Amino acid sequence: MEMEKEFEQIDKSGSWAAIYQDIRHEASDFPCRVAKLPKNKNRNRYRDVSPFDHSRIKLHQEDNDYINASLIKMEEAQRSYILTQGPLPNTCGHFWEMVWEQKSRGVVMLNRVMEKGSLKCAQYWPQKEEKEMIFEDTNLKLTLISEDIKSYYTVRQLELENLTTQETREILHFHYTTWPDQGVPESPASFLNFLFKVRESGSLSPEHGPVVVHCSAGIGRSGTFCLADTCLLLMDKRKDPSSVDIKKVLLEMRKFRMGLIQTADQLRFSYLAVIEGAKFIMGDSSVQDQWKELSHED
Ligand SMILES: [Mg+2]
- 3-state SS class at 71: strand
Determine the distance separating the centroid of ligand 1 and the alpha carbon of 131, expressed in angstroms. Answer: 9
Residue 259, marked binder: no
Distance 297 CA to ligand 1 centre (A): 22
Total count of residues recorded for the chain:
298
Tell whether residue 215 is among the known ligand binding residues.
Answer: yes
Distance (angstroms) between ligand 1 centre and the Cα of 97 equals 27
Resolution in A: 1.6
Q: Return d(Cα 267, Cα 61) in angstroms, integer.
A: 37
Q: Is 229 annotated as a binding residue?
A: no
Q: Annotated active-site positions, please?
A: 215
Ligand-binding annotation for 261, yes or no, is no
Per-residue DSSP letter, 122: -
Cβ atoms of 212 and 100 closer than 8 Å: no
Q: Check the annotation: does 220 bind a ligand.
A: yes
- Residue 292's contacts (CB-CB under 8 Å, 6 or more residues apart) are 193
Order across the sheet with 140-149: list the strands.
56-58, 66-74, 79-84, 211-214, 106-109, 167-176, 153-162, 140-149, 133-135
Question: Residue 2: phi, psi to the nearest 5?
Answer: -70, 135
- CA 127 / ligand 1 centre spacing (Å): 9
In degrees and rounded to multiples of 5, residue 99 shows phi and psi of -50, -45
- Three-state DSSP at 171 gives strand
CA of 171 to the centre of ligand 1 (A): 20
Instruction: Check: CB of residue 281 under 8 Å from CB of residue 235.
Output: yes
